[PDB]
Design an enzyme around this catalytic site. Structure first.
Site, short mmCIF file in Angstrom:
data_model
loop_
_atom_site.label_atom_id
_atom_site.label_comp_id
_atom_site.label_asym_id
_atom_site.label_seq_id
_atom_site.Cartn_x
_atom_site.Cartn_y
_atom_site.Cartn_z
N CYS A 39 0.79 -1.22 0.00
CA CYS A 39 0.00 0.00 0.00
C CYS A 39 0.83 1.29 0.00
O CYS A 39 1.54 1.59 0.96
CB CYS A 39 -0.94 0.01 1.21
SG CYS A 39 -2.03 1.46 1.08
N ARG A 98 -0.11 4.40 2.98
CA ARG A 98 -0.05 4.22 4.42
C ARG A 98 0.12 5.45 5.30
O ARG A 98 -0.02 5.37 6.51
CB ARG A 98 1.01 3.16 4.75
CG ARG A 98 0.50 1.73 4.56
CD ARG A 98 1.61 0.70 4.72
NE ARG A 98 2.55 0.70 3.59
CZ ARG A 98 3.68 0.00 3.58
NH1 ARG A 98 4.01 -0.74 4.63
NH2 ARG A 98 4.48 0.03 2.51
N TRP A 117 -9.29 5.52 -0.81
CA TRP A 117 -9.55 6.22 -2.05
C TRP A 117 -8.49 5.80 -3.06
O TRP A 117 -7.38 5.39 -2.71
CB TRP A 117 -9.62 7.75 -1.87
CG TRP A 117 -8.43 8.41 -1.27
CD1 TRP A 117 -7.27 8.76 -1.91
CD2 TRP A 117 -8.31 8.87 0.08
NE1 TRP A 117 -6.44 9.43 -1.04
CE2 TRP A 117 -7.05 9.51 0.19
CE3 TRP A 117 -9.14 8.82 1.20
CZ2 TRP A 117 -6.61 10.10 1.38
CZ3 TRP A 117 -8.70 9.40 2.39
CH2 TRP A 117 -7.44 10.03 2.47
N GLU A 175 -4.22 3.66 -10.69
CA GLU A 175 -4.89 2.38 -10.53
C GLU A 175 -5.97 2.26 -11.60
O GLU A 175 -6.21 1.18 -12.16
CB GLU A 175 -5.54 2.30 -9.16
CG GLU A 175 -4.61 2.12 -7.99
CD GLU A 175 -5.38 2.00 -6.69
OE1 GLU A 175 -5.63 3.05 -6.05
OE2 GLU A 175 -5.77 0.85 -6.33
C1 HEM Z 1 -6.13 6.37 1.82
C2 HEM Z 1 -6.14 5.98 0.51
C3 HEM Z 1 -5.42 4.88 0.05
C4 HEM Z 1 -4.62 4.90 -1.07
C5 HEM Z 1 -4.28 6.09 -1.98
C6 HEM Z 1 -4.08 3.57 -1.19
C7 HEM Z 1 -3.41 3.17 -2.35
C8 HEM Z 1 -3.08 1.87 -2.66
C9 HEM Z 1 -2.53 1.43 -3.95
C10 HEM Z 1 -2.08 2.28 -5.17
C11 HEM Z 1 -2.43 0.05 -3.86
C12 HEM Z 1 -2.06 -0.94 -4.99
C13 HEM Z 1 -3.27 -1.19 -5.89
C14 HEM Z 1 -3.02 -2.26 -6.95
O1 HEM Z 1 -1.92 -2.25 -7.55
O2 HEM Z 1 -3.93 -3.08 -7.19
C15 HEM Z 1 -2.86 -0.34 -2.52
C16 HEM Z 1 -2.84 -1.68 -2.05
C17 HEM Z 1 -3.27 -2.05 -0.80
N1 HEM Z 1 -3.80 -1.18 0.15
FE1 HEM Z 1 -3.91 0.85 0.09
N2 HEM Z 1 -4.50 2.74 -0.17
C18 HEM Z 1 -5.35 3.52 0.60
C19 HEM Z 1 -6.10 3.06 1.71
C20 HEM Z 1 -6.06 1.73 2.13
C21 HEM Z 1 -6.85 1.16 3.25
C22 HEM Z 1 -7.92 1.84 4.07
C23 HEM Z 1 -6.37 -0.11 3.48
C24 HEM Z 1 -6.76 -1.09 4.43
C25 HEM Z 1 -7.26 -0.99 5.69
C26 HEM Z 1 -5.34 -0.34 2.50
C27 HEM Z 1 -4.80 -1.61 2.30
C28 HEM Z 1 -4.14 -2.02 1.17
C29 HEM Z 1 -3.76 -3.41 0.90
C30 HEM Z 1 -3.88 -4.66 1.79
C31 HEM Z 1 -3.20 -3.40 -0.32
C32 HEM Z 1 -2.66 -4.61 -1.07
C33 HEM Z 1 -3.87 -5.20 -1.77
C34 HEM Z 1 -3.49 -6.32 -2.71
O3 HEM Z 1 -2.52 -7.04 -2.41
O4 HEM Z 1 -4.17 -6.49 -3.74
N3 HEM Z 1 -5.16 0.77 1.63
N4 HEM Z 1 -3.28 0.77 -1.76
N1 LIG Z 2 -6.90 2.25 -3.60
C1 LIG Z 2 -6.94 0.99 -3.14
N2 LIG Z 2 -6.59 0.02 -3.95
C2 LIG Z 2 -6.56 -1.41 -3.65
C3 LIG Z 2 -6.73 -2.20 -4.94
C4 LIG Z 2 -6.38 -3.68 -4.70
C5 LIG Z 2 -6.82 -4.56 -5.86
N3 LIG Z 2 -5.94 -5.75 -5.94
C6 LIG Z 2 -5.89 -6.57 -7.04
O1 LIG Z 2 -6.60 -6.35 -8.05
C7 LIG Z 2 -4.94 -7.76 -7.00
N4 LIG Z 2 -4.22 -7.90 -8.30
C8 LIG Z 2 -5.68 -9.09 -6.72
C9 LIG Z 2 -4.89 -10.13 -5.92
C10 LIG Z 2 -5.70 -11.42 -5.76
C11 LIG Z 2 -4.80 -12.62 -5.38
N5 LIG Z 2 -5.66 -13.80 -5.12
C12 LIG Z 2 -8.30 -4.94 -5.65
N6 LIG Z 2 -8.65 -5.99 -4.88
O2 LIG Z 2 -9.21 -4.31 -6.19
N7 LIG Z 2 -7.34 0.71 -1.89
N8 LIG Z 2 -8.02 1.55 -1.07
O3 LIG Z 2 -8.13 2.81 -1.34
O4 LIG Z 2 -8.56 1.07 -0.02
#
Ligand code: HEM
Ligand SMILES: N=C(NCCC[C@@H](NC(=O)[C@H](N)CCCCN)C(N)=O)NN(O)O
Ligand code: HEM
Ligand SMILES: N=C(NCCC[C@@H](NC(=O)[C@H](N)CCCCN)C(N)=O)NN(O)O
Ligand SMILES: C[C@H](O)[C@H](O)[C@H]1CNc2nc(N)[nH]c(=O)c2N1
Ligand SMILES: C[C@H](O)[C@H](O)[C@H]1CNc2nc(N)[nH]c(=O)c2N1
Ligand SMILES: C[As](C)(=O)[O-]
Ligand SMILES: C[As](C)(=O)[O-]
Ligand SMILES: [Zn+2]
Lengths: 404, 406
Positions: B110, B113, B282, B287
């Site tokens: 993420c 963070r 958000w 993305e």
């Molecule tokens: C405040 C705004 C936030 C922004 C701008 C942000 C942005 C991002 C971005 C750019 C990614 C990668 C997306 C992708 O490549 O599919 C990501 C992944 C992730 N974010 Fe954040 N995030 C935010 C809030 C959150 C929140 C509230 C949580 C959880 C409580 C969080 C948990 C995660 C997790 C677990 C991943 C990895 C998900 C995966 O492996 O597919 N994010 N976030």
């Molecule tokens: N802005 C974000 N973005 C989070 C986007 C994560 C995206 N991951 C994926 O699409 C992984 N490739 C899927 C991994 C699945 C493995 N079983 C999904 N599940 O839609 N979050 N927040 O703002 O909260």
């Protein structure tokens, strides 16, 4: 044990079995991954074993493993190390090892060419002056009037209790970096230290943004010597944009030959401290990193202000728009000047092929993802969607301490 | 010198050492033999749960500054008792709030963070049916969307029980576009969602035929088949896409939803596993504009937009993919701004993640990060994270991918 390697754009899957052949350790442990780190933090038996593997690799290459020629060559090596603590490579074995070290370079995206490498044997070198001749010839050949040809010149191997043959410059051709009055830097900021060593060693400094540096060549246990490169030996490309007529007025330009010269070539346990190589530039190296890194020419804002973008907020993507024109300027200029250059889409597509050729050939290919993926438009290239396994195979190119 | 990974920034030349990695208690996928850092998917006995629980409780009392106190020693006593006679145990309100935030904070992938401490935790461990799940989600979506001014939130449903079935949201996100398999082999809509769409229909969903049909939800209460719930249109905010200077872009008909609500990740705290715990914050500009809209295996609108910009798409060297992607991304940014919906571009986002690394360095001596996921899909070296070495390792609490329920 054997990693499942998937491609997320095509769903295809392969299993890297080549990694089993890795004899050396990387920076990662199960506890944590240090894959994004740039740099990493002999007993007759150790050397002898590395040598054996190499010779076995060579004969297998010529498809004559276990033969007479093989068995005898293995004894020669044994005999030499047992009596001298070291040994030497036969020109053909060296040619093979050089191509292989390049083939195993995890950070190289141009490995589809690994087989087409002109090897110059400069191991009969006893002076810096002699090194300069070899280098001046490598450049003439390599450049070939703008039709670049991959090549490497190999200097005397390292030797126990004797200083190293070294090329102080990290590249045969580089632009000087001149620290100035106001902490400012006229030229290439990455080359400040070497430009200063060149000065302290008697070079008369210029004051341009693109002043080709002289070479500091060093023969064993002797102070480095300064050699200036014949200007007409250094082919350069002035940069102009295809539609932005005002681009050319920025006076930007870049040399045509990318010749790494600070890396150590290891083959069969033997270490070659000076073995410059050169293929050809991938446009982003110049257009993205060299000209747009904030710690290089950092020309991003300039070009944007030129284009008249709103360099007032990140949301207008002026940085992204400027970056692309600069890369377009490079690709256009090298083509206009008829100099070999490869864009990042072309390059990565070819690397995708290489991955395939290597899967059939050896059962895998070591690759450093963070380096293979271009500095701009990452996901617009196939490699971004390709999983990779990184590991150390020898023959290999390693980094080594700066000789000062 | 220091005996921990040396971490360097090659732009500013600064150095730090990561000591936080020492707290990791789960091995990653790498070994000194090879690095598997670029792989997406890297491949309980009271004893194991007990220590995991003990570690979490220590982490919590540690966070409130009562480490080693009487309240601390008692809670540990309590958890052991409960685990001793029930096999599992429950977290207190404030403990769950703490853990959910740590899980986000510990998430290596993420880039957002810096907002970790500002997460609204909605406790739903009292939810008992799929219908109630839908209500919980509708509240989350409503509060989280807040009419375009997004607010980070996570709704936590009942932890997994021994033997008893899992609570699960089948959809990968609370809001996703249907993916329709065509006759001519192509896919209409989002190729990514082909299976969940096929599953929604198999469960009685009456499909549409557009590229942006909102999928219904397949929620699942313990031991029951998933029930189908359609999200009321007014609850799902969307942004029609348009370019600021390319007037014809608006005619393309591209659009995207505002709430990025990941819904099929497992939230693990002190050994407890919450199989359903949708979170949302958000979107980051790239993305939608770079991955969702330009990936070859997603909407793949790259060629279309390029053709509209009249770019030479016959040769790689014209950088037509690069010019288009930039415009598409600018459109995503422009349309969210115009519509007053919250979004952050890859530049600001990465500047803020740098600030976060600095904050975490001082606060815990490290920040686990996945370079490949932190560095954006376009303009990588134009952002500061690219020049920042990062150490990746697993810390708990944390989010984990989990098997698709079906
Ligand atoms: C405040 C705004 C936030 C922004 C701008 C942000 C942005 C991002 C971005 C750019 C990614 C990668 C997306 C992708 O490549 O599919 C990501 C992944 C992730 N974010 Fe954040 N995030 C935010 C809030 C959150 C929140 C509230 C949580 C959880 C409580 C969080 C948990 C995660 C997790 C677990 C991943 C990895 C998900 C995966 O492996 O597919 N994010 N976030
Ligand atoms: N802005 C974000 N973005 C989070 C986007 C994560 C995206 N991951 C994926 O699409 C992984 N490739 C899927 C991994 C699945 C493995 N079983 C999904 N599940 O839609 N979050 N927040 O703002 O909260
Ligand atoms: C012919 C065209 C070639 C192309 C397009 C190519 C391109 C590249 C690129 C993009 C990089 C990363 C550069 C950087 O970011 O600094 C790279 C790295 C590397 N290449 Fe190639 N390469 C080619 C030929 C060669 C040759 C001939 C050799 C060796 C014989 C070679 C050896 C390596 C090595 C060792 C690295 C790592 C450099 C480092 O760590 O600084 N390459 N190559
Ligand atoms: N087209 C190429 N490109 C490779 C360029 C490698 C570049 N490395 C660097 O600039 C590293 N950052 C230096 C790291 C050294 C630290 N030990 C250099 N030395 O100039 N090759 N061909 O041969 O064609
Ligand atoms: C810190 C990070 O590893 C570093 O900036 C890497 C990333 N990817 C790279 N990729 C290439 N081709 N060349 C580089 O020098 C780098 N630098
Ligand atoms: C194969 C490679 O790991 C894969 O394409 C990764 C690269 N970096 C990524 N980075 C982010 N933020 N999201 C992703 O889905 C990916 N995909
Ligand atoms: C064009 As210039 C400022
Ligand atoms: C301009 As559109 C097709
Ligand atoms: Zn690793």
């Amino acid at each position: 044990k054997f990693p499942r390697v998937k491609n997320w754009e095509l769903g295809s899957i392969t299993y890297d079995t080549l990694c089993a052949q890795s004899q050396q350790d990387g920076p990662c442990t199960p506890r944590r991954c240090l894959g994004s780190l740039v740099l990493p933090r002999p007993p007759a038996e150790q050397l002898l074993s590395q040598a054996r593997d190499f010779i076995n690799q060579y004969y297998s290459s010529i498809k004559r493993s276990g033969s007479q020629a093989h068995e005898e060559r293995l004894q020669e090596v044994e005999a030499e190390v047992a009596s001298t603590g070291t040994y030497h490579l036969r020109e053909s074995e060296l040619v093979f090892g050089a191509k292989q070290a390049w083939r195993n370079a995890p950070r190289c995206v141009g490995r589809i060419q690994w087989g087409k490498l002109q090897v110059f044997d400069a191991r009969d070198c006893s002076s810096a002056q002699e090194m300069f001749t070899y280098i001046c010839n490598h450049i003439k050949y390599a450049t070939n009037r703008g039709n670049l040809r991959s090549a490497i010149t190999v200097f005397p191997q390292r030797a126990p209790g004797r200083g190293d043959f070294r090329i102080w410059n990290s590249q045969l051709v580089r632009y000087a970096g001149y620290r100035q009055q106001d902490g400012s830097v006229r030229g290439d900021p990455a080359n400040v230290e070497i430009t200063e060593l060149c000065i302290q060693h008697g070079w008369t400094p210029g004051n341009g943004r693109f002043d080709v540096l002289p070479l500091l060549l060093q023969a064993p246990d002797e102070a480095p010597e300064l050699f200036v490169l014949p200007p007409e030996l250094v082919l350069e490309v002035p940069l102009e944009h295809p539609t932005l007529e005002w681009f050319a007025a920025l006076g930007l330009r870049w040399y045509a030959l990318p010749a790494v010269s600070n890396m150590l070539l290891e083959i069969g346990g033997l270490e070659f401290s000076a073995a410059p190589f050169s293929g050809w530039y991938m446009s982003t190296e110049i257009g993205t990193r060299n000209l747009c890194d904030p710690h290089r020419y950092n020309i991003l804002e300039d070009v944007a202000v030129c284009m008249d973008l709103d360099t007032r907020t990140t949301s207008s993507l002026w940085k992204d728009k400027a970056a692309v024109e600069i890369n377009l300027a490079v690709l256009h200029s090298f083509q206009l000047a008829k100099v070999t250059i490869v864009d990042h889409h072309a390059a990565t597509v070819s690397f995708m092929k290489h991955l395939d050729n290597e899967q059939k050939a050896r059962g895998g290919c070591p690759a450093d993802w963070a380096w293979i993926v271009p500095p701009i438009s990452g996901s617009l290239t196939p490699v971004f969607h390709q999983e990779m396994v990184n590991y150390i195979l020898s023959p290999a190119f390693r980094y080594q301490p700066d000789p000062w």
